[PDB]
Design a protein around this nucleic acid. Structure first.
Lengths: 49, 174, 47, 195
RNA sequence: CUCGA
DNA sequence: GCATCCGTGAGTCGAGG
DNA sequence: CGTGTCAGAGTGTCACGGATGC
């Protein structure tokens, strides 16, 4: 299972948090299985239904 | 149906919420390493998922079956593999660091061997350097040099004594 | 191995670079054998 | 997911972030920051300046940001993490060997759960521990409480080999031990010349 | 750990 | 928009455990 | 190997800056 390099997650400032515009605590909740994150949404299918 | 397989995963998520965090503090006192206790917890509940007999009767204490499974895992982890290795860490103080001796004695001998080698015939020098420097067999050198089997045996026999002559004439210790 | 080389480059190591470096995967968690001192196959000291 | 699963896709853990980096347009997010940078209020512009520093570097260099998420971890050669025998019969190994061993232990247990189809609660809670293991191997103690060895001593990670007075740079590169050298007590000698 | 400049 | 909190740094060399 | 009460860690630095967060 893929893992993230802690140097770019926990190292201040969070390099991943700067790239994806995600907050550090929210990024902490994602990697360590405290919260799901939405990867994609079929926005047109949602409108047609 | 499909909802029946999802009830099995909702059953495991239940015993996590009541027993996992309490089982973790049990393994922590038995081992002392928090990262090791998490390993014991995952292995314990994995056997609960593989034993429907322990998840069957709720009228029978299931928490206790976990504490003894954790006891047996830690007492098995406490056998031979841990016995020898677990003792010391190089990063930890009090352990001597490894050292390698200097190559002075080897460098001087290599210099004297190179001197006595130059005072050999091109045939003898090209035979000792194929038996001791290249480590070939007696017949391997015979095939390369295009000479007889016993020819390599005789050249090595003299070339060795020829070096002993050159070394003893310079005072090389026997 | 001369001692004049201009630049020393650093960069992110691709997971494909990590396999390009590696001479094999470390499968088993064992280290060595504690009698023969011979390292176990596919362990952390596999020959 | 039970209702509108046909419409969206979500995930947890590190593999999710790996998917966000793939579904990411580097050039667009770079220009989006440039628009804010060109005309913006300092309160919300400084926070947009620093993002560009990270984003612009990935664009020009040609190296993908996906490297921040690892599918494989390299193992340092054994002589740099040597296991020495002790005069008491037992052994002593570098802490890097206990960290590499814990990654291997948890990675092989995850391989069993995937094969067995174990409940998602065990697989997800296991994957989390694999992340903490690689985090400990690379920089133990960075996040949360460090992995203690025997005696509540924190294990030295790979990044511990480079930091500070005991790190590789200051201990073994800026200063070295040298051959052809000695030391003794100094005693004044008036008869000596200045040279 | 304890000490020397 | 700001108080909070995290992470960084804190002499060099030598002798014995 | 099989496993069915529960028993559970260290704690006297600080200055300083900037990302982190209600």
């Amino acid at each position: 299972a893929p893992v993230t390099h802690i140097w770019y997650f926990k190292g201040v400032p969070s390099r991943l948090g700067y790239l994806l515009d995600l907050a550090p605590k929210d990024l902490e909740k994602i990697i360590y299985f405290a919260a799901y994150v939405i990867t994609s949404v079929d926005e047109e299918m949602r409108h047609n239904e | 149906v499909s909802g029946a397989a999802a009830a099995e995963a909702a059953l495991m998520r239940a015993l996590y919420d009541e027993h996992a965090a309490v089982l973790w503090r049990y393994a922590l006192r038995l081992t002392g390493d928090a990262a090791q206790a998490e390993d014991v917890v995952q292995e314990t509940l994995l056997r609960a998922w593989q034993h429907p007999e322990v998840i069957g009767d709720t009228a029978r204490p299931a928490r206790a079956w976990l504490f003894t499974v954790a006891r047996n895992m830690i007492i098995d982890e406490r056998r031979s593999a841990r016995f020898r290795n677990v003792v010391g860490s190089t990063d930890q103080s009090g352990t001597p660091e490894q050292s390698t001796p200097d190559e002075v004695n080897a460098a001087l001998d290599r210099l004297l061997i190179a001197d006595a080698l130059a005072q050999l015939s091109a045939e003898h020098r090209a035979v000792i350097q194929r038996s001791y420097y290249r480590g070939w067999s007696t017949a391997q050198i015979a095939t390369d040099l295009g000479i007889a089997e016993g020819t390599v045996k005789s050249r090595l026999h003299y070339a060795v004594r020829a070096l002993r002559l050159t070394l003893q004439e310079l005072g090389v210790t026997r | 191995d001369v001692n004049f080389f201009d630049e020393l480059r650093i960069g992110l190591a691709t997971a494909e670079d990590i396999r390009q470096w590696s001479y094999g995967e470390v499968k088993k968690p064992e280290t060595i054998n504690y009698r023969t001192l011979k390292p176990e196959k596919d362990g952390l000291f596999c020959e | 997911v039970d209702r509108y699963g046909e419409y969206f896709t979500g995930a947890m853990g590190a593999e999710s972030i790996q998917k966000l980096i793939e579904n990411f347009d580097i050039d667009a997010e770079a220009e989006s920051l440039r628009d804010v940078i060109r005309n913006g209020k300092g309160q919300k512009k400084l926070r947009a300046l620093k993002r560009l520093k990270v984003v612009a570097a990935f664009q020009q260099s040609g190296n993908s940001p996906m490297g921040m998420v690892l599918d494989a971890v390299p193992v340092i050669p054994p002589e740099l993490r040597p296991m020495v025998q002790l005069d008491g019969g037992r052994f002593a190994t570098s802490d890097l060997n206990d960290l590499y061993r814990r990654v291997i232990n948890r990675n092989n247990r995850l391989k069993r759960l995937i094969d067995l189809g174990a409940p998602e609660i065990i697989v997800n809670n296991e994957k989390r521990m694999l992340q903490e293991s690689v985090d400990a191997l690379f920089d133990n103690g960075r996040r949360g409480r460090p992995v203690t060895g025997p005696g509540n001593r924190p294990l030295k990670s790979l990044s511990d080999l480079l930091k500070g007075k005991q790190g590789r740079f200051r201990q073994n590169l800026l200063g070295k031990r040298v051959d052809y050298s000695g030391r003794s007590v100094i005693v004044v000698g008036p008869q000596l010349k200045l040279h």
